[PDB]
């Protein structure tokens, strides 16, 4: 398990209308800010976004696997996509398979989607294959530089969850070396996936 | 762990502690370290607990398969040979099996020390485990061929008790089994806490 070309932190949190996921659009080569405007999330289904923090090569391989499996089940079901729970279960089983083959995908993969029943589904699978469904999931330093800023507002209004995620990513930009650039926000709602305009979440620089 | 088995004129006495412990913590004190294999055969469990339990129940399966395939039951030498061959096929896989195949067959009492390493040693007195040295000391010092069933069972029980006292890896209750021509007999599970003589001031 080795991370080289890494995607930065991800903070996903359920709010009233859906799941709000934020992450920088920068892939870092070690410590270098190598690639910009590279979304860490991939819309694998109209209501299922998949992000990952960690090696982005392993997240592109995982997205290839996910898209292939979704395409298989879509051809079988004449257009119907896999559900967010089914997609996350496949990611859990394929990442555990990779770990069991001793070639783990070194990326913590957040699956955020709306199941057809309308229930928000936010789950995460770590490189080892340990998966968990939660109302809010931070990956990378978004997990560490979080505190109660998400948990207090999770499942709340979009404004409250957005403010909490913005606080967490202000902390990330301040105290994460790999945090570079705008923080893209993606809303996975039962009405689809909307990429809100990326926001520069500036740390409080009156510290000096 | 501490398991012992000795052949005296009256049969095979197999006494085993019941402690499973890794590092310092005592994971259990009620571990059954004698797994029956045939109506008149058992296999002791020492070393790796999972390995001994899986391979002794697999040997029980193989013995039953042989007895149903062929009317003659699988002998104690043949059973220990099956087990030792299977365990040797996994040499280098860090299996840990210490196991005395104690049974009465057509050729009489038979104890075969079987180890993961593939050693299959016939003998009339064996002890396997961290505290097996203490059980060996008590046995070799107090063992007689002409001991009654009660005397032999108490000898095995006291050897296991002294092993439990002097070894951190041994403890719990001494499960004593008497194996005779007629079949395996499970004497009793005696708590070594009760066996300890607290009137003594030396230990």
């Amino acid at each position: 398990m080795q991370v080289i070309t890494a995607s930065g932190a991800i903070v996903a949190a359920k709010y009233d209308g859906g799941i709000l996921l934020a992450s920088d659009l920068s892939i870092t080569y070690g410590s270098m800010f190598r690639h910009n405007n590279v979304s860490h999330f991939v819309e694998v289904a109209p209501n299922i976004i998949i992000g990952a923090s960690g090696e982005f090569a392993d997240f592109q391989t995982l997205i290839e696997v996910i898209k292939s499996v979704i395409l298989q089940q879509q051809c079988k079901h004449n257009g119907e996509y896999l559900t967010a729970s089914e997609v996350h279960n496949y990611i859990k089983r394929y990442m555990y398979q990779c770990r069991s083959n001793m070639k783990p995908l070194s990326c913590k993969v957040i699956v955020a989607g709306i199941n057809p029943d309308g229930s928000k589904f936010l789950a995460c699978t770590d490189p080892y294959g340990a998966s968990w469904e939660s109302d809010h999931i931070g990956t990378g330093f978004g997990k560490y530089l979080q505190g109660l800023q998400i948990a207090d507002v999770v499942n709340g209004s979009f404004d409250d969850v957005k403010k909490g995620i913005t606080e967490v990513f202000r902390a990330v930009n301040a105290r994460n070396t790999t945090a570079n650039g705008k923080i893209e926000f993606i809303t996975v709602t039962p009405q689809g996936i909307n990429h809100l305009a990326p926001e520069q979440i500036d740390p409080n620089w009156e510290v000096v | 762990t501490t398991t012992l088995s000795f052949i005296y004129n009256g049969g095979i006495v197999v006494a085993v502690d019941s402690r499973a412990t890794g590092g310092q913590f005592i994971f259990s004190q009620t571990v059954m370290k004698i797994l029956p294999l045939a109506p008149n055969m058992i296999g002791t469990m020492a070393g790796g607990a999972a390995d001994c339990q899986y391979w002794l129940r697999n040997l029980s399966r193989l013995i039953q398969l042989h007895k149903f395939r062929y009317q003659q039951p699988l002998t104690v030498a043949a059973a220990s040979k099956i087990l030792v061959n299977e365990l040797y096929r996994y040499k280098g896989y860090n299996l840990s099996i210490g196991s005395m195949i104690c049974g009465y067959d057509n050729t009489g009492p038979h104890i075969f020390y079987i180890d993961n390493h593939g050693s299959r040693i016939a003998g009339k007195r064996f002890s396997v485990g961290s505290g097996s040295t203490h059980a060996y000391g008590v046995l070799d010092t107090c063992y007689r061929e002409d001991m009654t069933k009660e005397e032999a069972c108490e000898l095995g029980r006291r050897a296991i008790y002294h092993a439990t006292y002097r070894d951190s890896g041994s403890g719990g209750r001494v499960s004593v089994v008497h194996i005779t021509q007629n079949g395996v007999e499970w004497i009793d599970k005696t708590d070594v806490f009760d066996m300890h003589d607290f009137s003594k001031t030396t230990f």
Binding site: - | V84, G118, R120, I121, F126
Partner: protein
């Protein structure tokens, strides 16, 4: 590091082996027969882990019996020695048998072969596997005479085993000696 010692005579071979089997620091048995009678004519003393020695002995004995039954002829001592050597040469490179052996056979002529886990085959008048060779070879060199009688041979083997007992730090609690002659492999006591 078990003490097996072979001594070839004009018409016999005295093959002795450490009779003490062991588990870690415990001498489990004091009469374990480490010498494997692959054939009625060949006794293979084996030094190594008890499991490896037992499995290799059983494989070789089964193959010798299978050769005797497939073809109505028994293996020679050179043929058996080179079959063991082929087995060890195969093993070392892939799945090694960690057993150093002394093959003593009588097929009308006495034969003693120094064999090791790698597969070095050498007919020897006397030899040993384990650390006992460091103690017994010299005594053989000092006291072996061509045409040695069977009684003188037993005396010399007893001297070698006594040297193992006295000077080897891990002194075997006893030895099992077998005479391999025209009458077959007979276990003997050297006193």
């Amino acid at each position: 590091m078990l003490s097996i010692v072979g001594l070839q005579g004009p018409d016999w071979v005295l093959i002795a082996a450490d009779s003490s089997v062991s588990s870690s620091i415990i001498c489990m048995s004091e009469n374990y027969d480490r010498i494997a009678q692959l054939d009625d004519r060949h006794a293979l003393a084996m030094s190594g882990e008890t499991g490896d020695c037992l499995q290799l002995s059983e494989y070789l004995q089964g193959n010798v019996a299978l050769y005797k039954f497939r073809n109505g002829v028994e293996l020679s001592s050179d043929a058996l020695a080179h079959f063991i050597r082929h087995t060890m040469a195969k093993a070392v490179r892939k799945s090694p048998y960690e057993v150093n052996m002394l093959l003593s056979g009588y097929d009308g002529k006495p034969h003693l072969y120094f064999m090791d886990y790698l597969g070095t085959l050498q007919s020897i008048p006397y030899g040993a596997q384990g650390y006992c060779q460091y103690f017994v070879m010299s005594v053989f060199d000092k006291h072996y005479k061509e045409g040695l009688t069977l009684e003188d041979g037993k005396e010399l083997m007893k001297l070698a085993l006594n040297q193992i007992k006295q000077r080897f730090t891990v002194a075997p609690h006893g030895f099992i000696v077998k005479l391999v002659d025209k009458n077959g492999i007979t276990k003997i006591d050297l006193e």
